[PDB]
């Protein structure tokens, strides 16, 4: 029956949905979103262009592949061929 | 001088510890003039490797033929039972 | 090159994937049977839903 101290913070942000939005192998279309981040965790490759610091999105038709070309960097390409 | 082992038949299961209750110890061999053969030496004679030179030395084992002039490379000494498991061998060539 | 499966233990009280595998072999209630051709697609399923089934030959 004693007056307990006041908390200070609580107070979380909401969320953002991150991570992969398509996966290795399937068939995508020329506006769709591959991957998105608050930075650059995956560089783009051929036929994939960046957005405003986010949302690696495929230029044209095809299927997707993930790939590395340095020792740490990773990239995404789409080949329209089939 | 005094060692012997059997070429431990590979792909053993996780019942490897109920033969460690008897005083065995698994081991492998390396070396220039060999290929990696898992052996099963019994540690009852491993009060008799201190009794030749100590730690650094040479003692042969004879797993069939080709008693390798070897040297004790490393332990895996797990306490709380005061025992040694998985010692290793290394030829000198 | 044949296997016949028999469901011996029951299916309630087992988690949601193993209860969902055991109809894909075709078993439907206990003490049933089904005869299946041997296939490495089959003998991966009965590894998962082992400790229930009794097989032979």
């Amino acid at each position: 029956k004693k007056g307990v101290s006041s908390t200070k913070n609580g107070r979380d942000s909401e969320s953002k949905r991150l991570g992969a939005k398509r996966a290795d192998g399937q068939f995508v279309t020329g506006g769709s979103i591959l991957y998105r981040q608050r930075g650059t965790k995956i560089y783009p490759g051929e036929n994939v262009g960046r957005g405003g610091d986010d949302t690696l999105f495929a230029k044209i038709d095809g299927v997707v592949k993930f790939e590395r070309k340095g020792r740490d960097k990773k990239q995404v390409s789409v080949y329209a061929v089939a | 001088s005094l060692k012997s082992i059997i070429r431990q038949g590979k792909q053993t299961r996780s019942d490897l510890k109920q033969l460690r209750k008897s005083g065995k110890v698994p081991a492998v061999v390396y070396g220039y003039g060999t290929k990696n053969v898992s052996v099963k030496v019994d540690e009852v004679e491993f009060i008799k490797v201190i009794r030749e030179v100590g730690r650094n030395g040479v003692i042969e084992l004879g797993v069939g033929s080709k008693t390798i002039k070897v040297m004790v490379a490393d332990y895996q000494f797990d306490p709380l039972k005061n025992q040694i498991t998985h010692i290793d061998f290394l030829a000198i060539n | 090159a044949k296997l016949q499966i028999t469901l011996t233990r029951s299916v309630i009280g087992r988690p949601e994937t193993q209860r969902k595998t055991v109809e894909a072999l075709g078993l439907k209630k206990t003490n049933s049977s089904v005869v299946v051709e041997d296939n490495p697609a089959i003998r991966g399923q009965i590894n998962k839903v082992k400790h229930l089934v009794t097989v032979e030959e």
């Binding site: 004693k2 307990v4 006041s6 908390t7 | 730690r55 000494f77 306490p79 709380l80 | -």
Partner: protein
Amino acid sequence: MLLPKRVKYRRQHRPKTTGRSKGGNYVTFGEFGLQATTTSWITSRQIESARIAMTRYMKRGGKVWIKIFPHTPYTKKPLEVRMGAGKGAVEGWIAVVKPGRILFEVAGVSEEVAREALRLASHKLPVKTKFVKREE
């Protein structure tokens, strides 16, 4: 009363008290060691109260170290309040021992003396202990 000087954040979790020991279970410094075998905490005041009882039987002779410096804080909410408004302040420090890791290493002594003095400080600790000497 060994304390950390600086601590990043003053209110932290409690360590996962399972498993084996990380390492540090081979003695390196003294000839004679004392390791543990059961899984409690030690609360930064045993570790000096096992140091003063250790020193006086040897009359400050040979070298004696410790090996367990407490890093983690732990908080006790004040005298009889209802549950939940935030964590309480710290009151001590702690370092969790796993089974099978060395507490004390002593040197500069015969065997028959130091084996007594480790026993006399093994009753000041909330753990079960066992004598040991330089795995060779």
